[PDB]
Design a protein around this ligand. Structure first.
Ligand SMILES: [Cu+]
Length: 153
């Protein structure tokens, strides 16, 4: 799993959030092109706890074109918790301690926000067609809704 983290101040976080290359429609974000950029964040201020936000939507379904290189940036903006962003083919409902192995691509637990900064990381993914789920591994978070669906077709 990806366990390399960097630190960003709030203006940087806001700059990164804007680089998500998807197009929104309802609660679905559709990507296109050879290399797509997904920028996900754990609980942006004002959004429900616990949840992921992508392109300013709460836990949206991501539609990725088969064959595309997926560059994912995950930022933890939630004070007090070190959420994770992990892709699995296991489906909901998720248990308190969810069984999601094998994890196809993902992040380890992120550092908690500190000293006016937020931890973030980048990882690459080359999916095969089919449906996946992005989830947080902190006990009880996926069970309470911190997960979204990904359709690679
Ligand atoms: Cu979480």
């Amino acid at each position: 799993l990806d366990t390399s983290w960097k630190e960003a101040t709030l203006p940087q976080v806001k700059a990164m959030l804007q680089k998500d290359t998807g197009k929104v429609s309802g609660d679905t974000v559709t990507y296109s092109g050879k290399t797509v950029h997904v920028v996900a964040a754990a609980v942006l201020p004002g959004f429900p706890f616990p949840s992921f936000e992508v392109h300013d939507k709460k836990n949206p379904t991501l539609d990725i074109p088969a064959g595309a290189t997926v560059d994912v940036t995950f930022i933890n903006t939630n004070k007090g918790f070190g959420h994770s962003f992990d892709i699995t083919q296991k489906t909901p409902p998720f248990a308190v301690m969810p069984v999601i192995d094998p994890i196809v691509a993902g992040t380890g637990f992120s550092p908690v926000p500190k000293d006016g900064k937020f931890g973030y990381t980048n990882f690459t993914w080359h999916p095969t067609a089919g449906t996946y789920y992005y989830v947080c591994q902190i006990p009880g978070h996926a069970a309470t809704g911190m997960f979204g669906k990904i359709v690679v077709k």
